[model samples]
Target: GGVAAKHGFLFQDCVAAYHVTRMLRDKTIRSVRCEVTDDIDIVSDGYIDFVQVKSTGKTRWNISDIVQNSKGADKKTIPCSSILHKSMQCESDLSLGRRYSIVTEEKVNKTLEYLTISPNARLDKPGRQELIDDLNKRTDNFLTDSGISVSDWIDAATWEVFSSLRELELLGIKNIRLASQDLHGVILSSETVAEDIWCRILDTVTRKGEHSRRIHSADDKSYLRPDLLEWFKQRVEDDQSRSGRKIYVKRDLPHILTPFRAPMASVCAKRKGQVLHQQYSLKKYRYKHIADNVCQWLDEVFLRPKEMSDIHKLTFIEKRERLKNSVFKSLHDVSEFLGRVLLHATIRQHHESQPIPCMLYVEKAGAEKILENVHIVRRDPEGDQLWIGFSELVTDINIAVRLPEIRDQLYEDISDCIDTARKKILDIKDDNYLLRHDIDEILDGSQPFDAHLDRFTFVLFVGYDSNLLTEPETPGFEDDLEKETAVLFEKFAADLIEDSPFANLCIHVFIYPAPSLERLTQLVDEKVREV
Candidate 1:
């Protein structure tokens, strides 16, 4: 009857934290620290466990999760560089050392184990004697260069060698903890224990071949034991010490609960003073249904809630205008809509009063129709020349380098109108503006001719200069010549634009680290007003 609480990442973290805290209470762990660096969730004296707990879903940890030098990219390196640096600082302290303790014996034993089992040991007979000889030779400065005592060097090298070893043979890493009787047990105190239990469970299930057997089929249909639900209800309800904490069910409690725990409690709730245990006959048809509903509620309340921030502050009028002036057409729906809104807000802020007289259109949107129908006419700017044309070409294509196809088409389409268009271009002063799309695409090879260019509308072309000539000296590099092709394209495009009668068209190429269209629109407007 209580308000339903949402379950998500926060819920999982809390649940994992709770389990980790309880697990570390065993005598082996000296103490536990949470939120330590290196992705470590819980750190004790001897181990730093990176715990990733899931409640509703399941996953597996592999060798990459442990064994620092595993063959995969990890955020934290094995044989921790930080620890090695700290060890370097302790060389002086070791010189003023006290007598060896149990810790020293443990290190020496670990060194022996490393030499015997590690592939990098490189010894003919791998045993305690091999480790002793190697350490003595290295320590006495007979093997290599070193200032540290043999004991200290052996100790440091032991950690490094142990950390570098592979751990793929530990099949326990791939074990899954299913929702069953064992869920309530606090026996999984350490990594070794957890892994062993996982392996045992998997091995037992696999040996029986139940893991591979089809659960639902005419030939091999399977059913849950009728007593299973009753056992589950009893297990969850009677287990007061390790069952659902009160914080889990109470929505307003200060104690954070796991997202799935509340729904887990619901699975065994009492109805009208009678325990509502699952019926084995119904579980086959309804288990997924109940699970889906629980997950849906959790996601709706927690995972997918609307974000509240400054972007949501637009007035209804502003939003309506934004939707109307959105630069991206509906055909390229998602990211384009966002980009359009950004450009609109940017342009409006800078150009509120002296708006640029331009008509905008998408090259793909009735572009051929415009080319076929429109007439080019020149008029004097001071004689109330109605500026009424803006067309934007979104560089959305599969091949980025093929953008010049559009630019070439633009030039050809307006070729007949060039004399008139050229006149209009000449009439434009510094106060006038020209916004063209895909000029930079012509320069740089990244035209997105055949790739997803969804909202990269604003493009500028800096003049092709000395930077393009600095070619790499690699042999046969020019023959393959991908970089050279781009350089040639850039120089050609730059030269063409520079020599054209439509030189006034290059006004849009602003400085590098270009102000976004939003700020640029305002700058143009401010400049036009000054004129």
Candidate 2:
């Protein structure tokens, strides 16, 4: 039996085709041009060359990472053109079955370069030679079992897959094979070849965070911080509705949830309905049942933060329970859910090419391990800010009834976390009342605040009041109560400010709860989005 196929295969395949299109666009493949025919179709000068790229291990690979992995090794004389064609075309119309053979060659060389190996092979210096040797040892050879001669492989050992990708740069070559033995006779490569090798080696060495290096261009850097990206995606996707398009920044998204704000809510509702009627009235999208608790919270609570002025810095921390319907929960469930949702939205918006790329920056270094880091942090730190600018894509997709509810949920999702943080702060203050003098310099590190990551507060450009919300002045009047509060909650505090020349840039906390990995993520997402 064949292996168990994943359900997202179709979407994943589309992602793969996109990867090849992006990388090959800039590649210097000499003989033939690889061009994208359409969104889902990629062909090399009108011939079918398909590469059904899939991952084998636990950690998932993004489109960019998949293209990078496809870089290793060239299988000589495999006639990848037919197979590659089958793989690519099959997705556009699934009814067509394979008209090819059994074995699949991961590599498909489209240009003349793939036909033969380069004459001069450069050997690695003694110490840096293990990678090459590892590639040369092969344990399986069923591909050669179809009455193919040993001469086809040219006597190269099985491990040569490594050299094919990194050392020889051979997999990208199209339709060429030279005997490995003949390579033993050549001395050195031409100056042109020497330069190519130098540049490739230098590029590899200089790149930071080697694990996240992407070979695909269409994919945004945000793919690294997938959770945050997804959160952005879900939000923008909801915006297509009259409800969403009408949002147009500087509007309160959650205000529509209140009946008292009927005029505002009516405008929002009408706009949302019109958009959905225009874009997707004919289609059925996913739906969710609203929780009574959620609705009750919306109806009963009026979240009113004081119009606190002269605030040097501010950080908002929020939490929501995961397994929304599940009763049993862990403390970090809320943080984990938020992280995933955030990444989901960001990635979706990027793929759809929405305007106003969600801005991201890092205030701390807590997310170095997951796929989410790529979205919020740049590896090089030397290049331009890696924000995805998906402008000029005039998509007509809109939402009507369901979208606003979805938007409400997203807002609730974010607001829930904020509410949790506020409660925790009040509880802490009630238990260990800190003097007012201390709260002022809490962000200045006059004392230690280490536990919370997403607790940074931003100086609102406008007052907390809906009417007088204007950006606060520079050198906001300092209050010691603020400083001491942060010191006392050092474990739970984080802060942000937009003032360009403020003396303090790094955030310091005054007070916080005992350390937990979950709060670290909430603060992490906030810091990333602030940038």
Candidate 3:
């Protein structure tokens, strides 16, 4: 029953704005306050109309529903705070020229319609005069009382109705576009123009009605104040800027995944983990003991192009099904690491306080550096070379050990990888693919490549024992995996061990716990095959 109430409230707020749009035409109209005295209030020179935009549901409005003076289940006269009774309370506070009005988009019963002096109020003119009816007296008694004269009550109170809710929305949009033409000299009548312009107007009204504070209590433009034109002008500019493709802007980062505070946040949710488990791990084990082939193509790498550079893809695991044990199986590696990187980047695209927070797995040729580092080898790490990449972020990674037991050999492996990675970067001679391009644009042609390494990030993918695969979810699965992972992570922070390789310097430790790498090799083999 309550589910439909918000639709009415939203429609009230929407039609609340539907009425506000009418104020733009009235230059003399003063402050437009929403939910101040009633649903909406129009304050102007010797004029004030508290509006109640009523929403329709299953059937038409009956006379007795609004007034409590009628027969009820308890018998006798009905005397409750009904819709009409509430209007009287609000109308009692009115000055001589002002009264409350109900703005509806649906029909009322003949008797309810009969009570109004000029119920058929129009957008073009004032209400009509009517012969007061017997029903009106019964309705008034049901309303308890009003001090104003019958004709005064009849004349001041208006029942304004529209054809439908869409009629209200379209009518409001047309009104604003007309105002935009007159006030701002901006005539927008394109496919989405009316909808967009009206959206700005609707948003302001909805936001104002959502909360209740004194209009001046805060800095936010919570109330629809007198400076309505200026408000429209600013929003109009913002909407245009938002629609324009010429302007480049970053996406707003999400709040839940904020500025690098929690490491546990990056892993997939439990439901998502279950999906990963079923898709990659369990189906292979449960269905049959026959080991399926994964890395099908022998020599081709499966990295897709524009991933880091101009090239499309470099798949080294496609044809080589027989070589799964010896091969690095880079397609699976890219699928695992690069997929995680993209997901991580997407999560931060809407951070709480941080601006322009976003990331992606970039190409090798894309992430160039000054003195050292060339096409930043992203497909698979070359011989005696560490995996490095370019983009806005210069990322370097080392898969310390394939099996889960990197703990014993972790430090020496990390030290050696970093030692060579650093040395390989420092041995610069403009040999890297896009070295001169960055130098030409980032500096004058006269300047030689400088030795200053401004930014560097190292990622260490350590492992557990070869026993666990896509582990099932327990109550404390995440805590258990991450708890032991942090201990292994701290091994790298033993000392800076810094030979000075640069800012934004940090070590990121990651572990992708599979049943075993050899087990993944089976899955990777079948994936690249005909299947």
Candidate 4:
């Protein structure tokens, strides 16, 4: 087996790159770029940060510590030179918007014996003095020898090494020490600009811990927190204002800072059916779900101080569990929808684009079902023709699905359909028909829209409510069941179309209520009439 593959270190620099982007975007500040340079891992509009991600056996991170277990004989400290190098490059490109920062994975102690306390007061005087001597050697002596200005060096490190937390404090270098459980916590905590933005979001509700404090308070529907609506409005205005600055500002900044769009609105005015229908039918577009409980709490504490008294009462474990249920559950919903949406796109393409006629036939069994056959839609249609077995898709759509365990089975069902579709596409071979780019790409697992596939009619019979198929019963499953199912289909779609020959499979998806044969045909006809 590959001679016991060498252990790979877990690198959080990649994680840090995304973390900064999200943090800036959370506050309505645009994220400029990521991994801008080897040294600079993340760049937002106002600030840039150099990150050194190291996993360590040591207890705490010292200011002048080097990568001790590095491969070469010489251990290398943080690349202070390059950190200064990139900052100057960025400053030249964009006039100083804000000061840069140094982000790291290592834990920074607020008080270090050598830096924080009086040298004479410490019990381990020799050890503290040795650390002091090392700092002088590493920082002061190095700067003197390198001929770099002290101010430039100080600004580069985001902190001077002479003192403790105050330098880290005064320099504005945030100690967003990476934690698996607190990944979101680190980004949200590091934010300074968004505090007020969040405050405005919270004030819409109430300042007291009465019924208004509840996240989805029905009593005060008129005043319930508007989630990202307030933030989104300002974001749009800020973007327009930034765009207006053309004299000195480079137009390149927009392309660089493009991903910092407003998060999906938690409360949409559109009909549920319309939204769900669009999600099912649209090939290139989909809705983004944003139901965040933690952000809610953060907004609450900032806007309404009284709630902090209640929040402080919960223990660490209790808070974690509460957030898991409230914040994470909604995140799961968003994630699940995105996944299922993509899978449906892949499936629709495969079913519609077959050069020969075929159907995804479903055979029933006790407590289980088998996706058994792919029957031809027509012996030889004038053009490519493909059909779906509607009964098969929603055999158990009406069933009140249970949480956690049963959800797994539901996803498995979706996977089976995708797998069967892949096999069906590969099995058929008709050289007479010309496959579209996507159909060819899809069949061979190699690779879109109404522009060209325009003439061909697409019929997608969405068995039952799309929500029922995608959503999971909470409490039993902390993860987004829809996302889980979607992920499975994406991979399955990839494998199904791998190296298969097909082109331009076009189809539409329609939601059919419950599980039945006549409904499927009627819905198909109804969908066809729209075009």
Best by TM-score: 3
Worst 10 residues of 2 by lDDT: 271-280
Per-residue C-alpha lDDT of model 2 across residues 1-531, encoded as one tens digit per residue: 001011111222223322332323222111111132112222322222232323334333222222232323465332322322223224323322112111112332322122123223324313123322322232122133233222222222111112112222232111011211121111122333323322322222222224332222233321121222232223233333323222122222221111111111121121110000001112321111111112222211222111111011123231232212433155254344433332223332222332121222222223321112122222233321222111111112222222233333433432332223121111111111122222222323344443322232211000011111112321322244234222322211111122323112122111111112233344433332332
Each candidate structure's count of clashing pairs: 17, 111, 45, 24
Q: Write the per-residue lDDT of candidate 1 for residues 319-431, one digit (tens) a residue.
A: 45654433323333422322232222223222223323222222332232232111112223421222222223233332234335534544544333222211122222112
List, residue by residue over 1-531, the lDDT tens digit for candidate 3: 121132343557566666667766556555566743236777754678767776557577665555544355565655554566556556424463566788766677665564443535433443223333443565553433556444554566777666655666777778877876654444553636666546555655655333321123234423443456556656455544666522222223222111222544222111011011212333343212212211222211233212222121124355234324543446455335333332233222322222111112222334542311122222222211122222111122232332223333433433332323121233322111222233222222243224312222333333223233344433333445444445444444333333323212343444444344444444544544433
Model 1 alpha-carbon miss at residue 187, Å: 78
What is the TM-score (0 to 1) of candidate 2? 0.18
RMSD of each: 28.7, 25.3, 22.8, 26.2
Model 3: residues >4 Å from true position, as ranges?
A: 1-9, 36-38, 55-58, 69-80, 91-96, 114-136, 139-146, 189-193, 208-225, 239-531
Please report how far candidate 1 places residue 419 from its true position, in Å. 3.7
Question: For candidate 4, lDDT tens digit of each residue in 53-133?
Answer: 333347655553431222333565444443333333343245433444444444545433333333235555444445445
Residue 71 miss distance in model 3 (angstroms): 13
lDDT of 4 at 33: 34
What would the TM-scores of all predictions be? 0.18, 0.18, 0.36, 0.21
Cα error, candidate 4, residue 11 (Å): 5.4
What would the TM-score be for candidate 4 when compared with the true structure? 0.21
